[PDB]
Design a protein around this ligand. Structure first.
Ligand SMILES: Cc1cc2nc3c(=O)[nH]c(=O)nc-3n(C[C@H](O)[C@H](O)[C@H](O)COP(=O)(O)OP(=O)(O)OC[C@H]3O[C@@H](n4cnc5c(N)ncnc54)[C@H](O)[C@@H]3O)c2cc1C
Ligand SMILES: Cc1cc2nc3c(=O)[nH]c(=O)nc-3n(C[C@H](O)[C@H](O)[C@H](O)COP(=O)(O)OP(=O)(O)OC[C@H]3O[C@@H](n4cnc5c(N)ncnc54)[C@H](O)[C@@H]3O)c2cc1C
Ligand SMILES: NC(=O)c1ccc[n+]([C@@H]2O[C@H](COP(=O)([O-])OP(=O)(O)OC[C@H]3O[C@@H](n4cnc5c(N)ncnc54)[C@H](OP(=O)(O)O)[C@@H]3O)[C@@H](O)[C@H]2O)c1
Ligand SMILES: NC(=O)c1ccc[n+]([C@@H]2O[C@H](COP(=O)([O-])OP(=O)(O)OC[C@H]3O[C@@H](n4cnc5c(N)ncnc54)[C@H](OP(=O)(O)O)[C@@H]3O)[C@@H](O)[C@H]2O)c1
Ligand SMILES: CC(=O)CSCCS(=O)(=O)O
Ligand SMILES: O=S(=O)(O)CCS
Ligand SMILES: [Mg+2]
Ligand SMILES: [Mg+2]
Lengths: 522, 522
């Protein structure tokens, strides 16, 4: 059953409704076929997958006057991001942050008494499931009506060879393939891993048909594990994170990492380093009842009926590699050169399929650079020196070098931080700005008002790294990183116009010290 | 009593406690005397006032190796900002944003029932009052111990001539004066303005000895009026704004201003344009009971026991201009040239005393620039092309040109915005990021998820303006403005590394259009 959608013009909200209908149809729903049957030009590229990489790649290719076709097995464009990855992740992190605020000020002002309050995880997941077609609807609309994309959705692609793809029972030819099928959730090789009650980011939002009990176990120690783990904890649940090595190694600044981990522990999270699950115990109903794990302090058993795996994502390379003869790396990533070209002539690979860093900027940018190459513009892509962030119950942003890292690299350094390093320590009403004001003024809560630091070369006066725990700095790090890569000094930073009270206090604190030829930390 | 504090070394929290004693001393308290009795250099500059401009001016002058003294009539440094201006404003705005969220999701998830809920205005002001000695503490601490400054606090300065000041029973000498006494709240010349129950930002935090009733009248239609008015409204009080002309003229982009005003009215704010208060009515106890105003539709009377004036701030120029004979401008601002020099030899003026823009960047920078000029380094300062922000129940950030502005100005332009212009209008799940996810996903709340736009020159491809309503962009606008001043194009914007999901979607939305030589709006 093929719906010829070319000459239909659904609104965003009609698209949202229609996608929902197709997703819910017992038979699997109709194919969405949006192809210009009157255009005689050959396809410059067929994209296998229309997630962040395939969709942006197609948008750019089309903007350059080339012809593209997306094939995606989902009835929407945008891939994992709206459906089960960054979007739900951010809804859950918004909840985690507000819940920490509510629990900190329990029984003060407008805040409800949270003492005995357990928030339903399923309730919030269901809110996500009920609203996720909004972003789906915009993706289908924007792609067709504003970006002029051709696509076939709700259809697994069947790659024939490096120039030939079957979709919707039609065979299409192209000058190139861009492979954009992303990566699937990592798993554990232990008894019980397939028990009901074991989830990952993908299955959480498809299969949670009960409300978890009082204890949650999270496996993993980076972004996904810590993001979902803080949300679970914020709902009122005892949360134990089993971390194979050490948690949050992405936070290179030791003081920043410590603040973040300390705040997580204050919220009641238990974070266990050097630990590996050995078994997930099932009850006689087939649901998880406990997790057994080896740690540096011997075997532990944690009773729980809800386990969340936040391991890495595994590139979806197997089928395509068999068909096309693609060279793969150790973790199954499709090997590419710096023009995104695979070992196979005229076949590019992009997004999570080509491995880490698995981020939206990497996905969209690799998509567009492959598209430029297909359109005859020789352009390399090597992601390097990018800013980064993750959520706990706070926003955590970082770029460049940690303070220790900068010294080990041979730099003489000063730092500018908040709060100052004093006898009263964190227990002072700084740093403060939007969404930290209550922490800053509340009785005994001032230590929660945030932490931040820039790392500066004492000789060149260049800013070598920036680090922030709080709210409202993440967006700023995108732009600040560009200024830093251009060579930003403490002097130039001090010379900017601040917008006080500012999530980053870097500008004015830089100004307080830049009047000196010999720089001193603040 | 004059306390020689020079060799005492209070912590931040010790300072906090002790400014308290002094402020709540029945007699006015001792003078805080922090002067270096060894230094034989003559003062390069005495600063009259130790607020933002005075304090930062001193920091920089001292950093450059010069000698400074601050005289301030408060027992703390930092000026209006920590005591009654930006800091309490940000606390009230945090409450306003959090309260809109709670009222929107009342009786859902963790959110309690807000239906009959009136939050205490006095309670929140008392919270501010109870904690502001935190910030005062950091201020005196960091100024003495970290920034190596000399100061005399809790003592009004008596300026004798352009080289002489009396303070703490003593007479001081200096090569220059830097006049930095700020501005005081504007008022009305109507009967009843001196009634009990009429406040401005300064008196609200000193004299609020009751809980306001159910209607609040705000007078004014710019930053202060809208910031405090949204907070009053967020507490659950009927809030009527009486606006001489039109509200929020600072928001130049028409659609951006409309979104902001639309969301204010949706929260239940009443904004009456073209209106002037004619009488504040008093009850038999001399308390406000109503406001009478002339409007375009004739006289109106609003019953109320709490009036908030959010008018201009007026430069404190009178006394100083009499003692020194300074030239003033038409609002009483001390006139200065590009080096911050007044009409009087060796006397400079900075901060709010020199007029608009009355912002922290301006006060601190004008402060530092006058210090550099005092120190022989000839540097000119004319604030222009700065970013700006205000709070409603949202953060509202803006720089450069609005859309209509740019076309009227003879720029051929394209716009990249979110949500798109479609028949579903604002009722779609974008824009979305931290602190707008619940709006994005909730039933009937999607129009609340925000609004944003960049304005782009179609031929140079340069970004001419940027506009954002939501949360978490304010800090970015600091850094984004600098890039725009350096010549930022849509292609350079698109080439950056976004941190998805980002408060500003500008990077990726630019990337969607940047592949075409002829740009098309999104
Ligand atoms: C929980 C989680 C949270 C994250 N949070 C963030 C974040 O906050 N910020 C950030 O930058 N990144 C985040 N990421 C990473 C981000 O989601 C990915 O890097 C990105 O989505 C990768 O895009 P992609 O196009 O490569 O793959 P995908 O989004 O996975 O798209 C692949 C597409 O290929 C299609 N497909 C697969 N096989 C076939 C086939 N046989 N036939 C047809 N179609 C097929 C799929 O239907 C899918 O639509 C997060 C990831 C996860 C897992
Ligand atoms: C309600 C409100 C909210 C605001 N919010 C923001 C914001 O969010 N962001 C922003 O950038 N700006 C904001 N502003 C503007 C900002 O407060 C001012 O631009 C800034 O405080 C001006 O600094 P200043 O040093 O010039 O004056 P002030 O901070 O007022 O300092 C003046 C000092 O002079 C002293 N003084 C006066 N007379 C004497 C005397 N004769 N002897 C000794 N000392 C004397 C006073 O004690 C005072 O300490 C806000 C203003 C208001 C009113
Ligand atoms: N921007 C965001 O907020 C966000 C949110 C979610 C995901 N993401 C992105 O999505 C990508 C996913 O891949 P990744 O680079 O995160 O993978 P990764 O770094 O290899 O691993 C992620 C975590 O899984 C753990 N892990 C992997 N295999 C394990 C195993 N067999 N047993 C126990 N633990 C195991 C790792 O622990 P050790 O390192 O301790 O071995 C690590 O903590 C990341 O790049 C991430 O940045 C981003
Ligand atoms: N960064 C921030 O978020 C922030 C927050 C608060 C304050 N501030 C600063 O504090 C300064 C205060 O000065 P301002 O610029 O607000 O002064 P302004 O522009 O002269 O006036 C501010 C508002 O008061 C109104 N007003 C003035 N006199 C009035 C009168 N007699 N009757 C009725 N209304 C009157 C004006 O109305 P009309 O225009 O309708 O005549 C305007 O709405 C500002 O410059 C601002 O920079 C900054
Ligand atoms: C609506 C939305 O942005 C969903 S997540 C991003 C998908 S895409 O724009 O990267 O294809
Ligand atoms: O600008 S100052 O640091 O003096 C005051 C900030 S509240
Ligand atoms: Mg603090
Ligand atoms: Mg919306």
């Amino acid at each position: 059953k093929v719906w010829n959608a070319r000459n239909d013009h659904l609104t965003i909200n009609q698209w949202a409704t229609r996608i929902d209908e197709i997703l819910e149809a017992p038979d699997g729903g109709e194919v969405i076929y949006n192809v210009d049957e009157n255009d005689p030009r050959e396809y410059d590229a067929i994209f296998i997958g229309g997630g962040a990489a395939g969709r942006f790649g197609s948008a750019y290719l089309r903007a350059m006057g080339g012809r593209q076709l997306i094939v995606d097995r989902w009835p929407f464009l945008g891939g994992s991001c709206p459906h089960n990855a960054c979007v739900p992740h951010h809804l859950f992190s918004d909840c985690a942050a507000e819940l920490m605020l509510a629990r900190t000020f329990s029984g003060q002002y407008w805040f409800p008494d949270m003492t005995e309050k357990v928030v339903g995880i399923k309730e919030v997941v269901d809110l996500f499931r009920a609203g996720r077609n909004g972003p789906h609807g915009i993706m289908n609309f924007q792609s067709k009506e504003q970006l002029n994309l051709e696509y076939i959705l709700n259809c697994p692609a069947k790659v024939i060879d490096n120039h030939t793809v079957e979709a919707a029972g039609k065979v299409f030819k192209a000058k190139n393939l861009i492979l954009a099928v992303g990566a699937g959730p990592g798993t554990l090789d232990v008894p019980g891993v397939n028990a009901k009650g074991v989830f990952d980011h993908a299955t959480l939002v498809e299969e949670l048909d009960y409300e978890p009990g009082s204890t949650v176990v999270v496996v993993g120690g980076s972004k996904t594990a810590v993001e979902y783990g803080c949300f679970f904890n914020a709902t009122g649940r005892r949360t134990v994170m089993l971390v194979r090595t050490e948690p949050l190694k992405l936070i290179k600044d030791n003081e920043t990492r410590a603040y973040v981990l300390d705040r997580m522990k204050e919220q009641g999270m238990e974070i266990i380093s050097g630990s590996n699950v050995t078994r997930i115990e099932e009850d006689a109903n087939g649901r998880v009842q406990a997790v057994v794990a080896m740690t540096p302090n011997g075997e532990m058993r944690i009773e729980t009926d809800f386990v969340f795996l936040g391991l890495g994502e595994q590139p979806r390379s197997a089928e395509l590699a068999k068909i096309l003869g693609l060279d793969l790396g150790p973790k199954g990533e499709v090997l590419v050169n710096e023009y995104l070209q695979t070992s196979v002539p005229n076949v590019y690979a992009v997004g999570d399929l080509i491995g880490g860093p698995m981020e939206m900027f990497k996905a969209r940018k690799s998509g567009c650079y492959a598209a430029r190459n297909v359109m005859g513009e020789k352009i390399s892509y090597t992601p390097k020196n990018y800013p980064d962030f993750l959520h706990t119950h706070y926003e955590v942003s970082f770029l460049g070098m940690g303070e220790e890292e900068a010294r080990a690299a041979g730099h003489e350094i000063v730092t500018i931080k908040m709060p100052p390093d004093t006898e009263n320590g964190l227990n002072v009403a700084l740093p403060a700005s939007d969404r930290t004001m209550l922490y800053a003024f509340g009785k005994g809560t001032a230590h929660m008002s945030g932490f931040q630091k820039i790392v500066i070369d004492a000789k060149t006066r260049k800013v070598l790294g920036a680090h922030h725990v709080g709210y409202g700095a993440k967006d700023a790090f995108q732009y600040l990183n560009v200024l830093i890569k251009q060579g930003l000094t403490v002097d130039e930073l001090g010379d900017m116009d601040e917008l006080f009270l500012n999530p980053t206090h870097f500008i004015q604190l830089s100004r307080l010290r830049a009047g000196s030829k010999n720089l001193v930390s603040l």
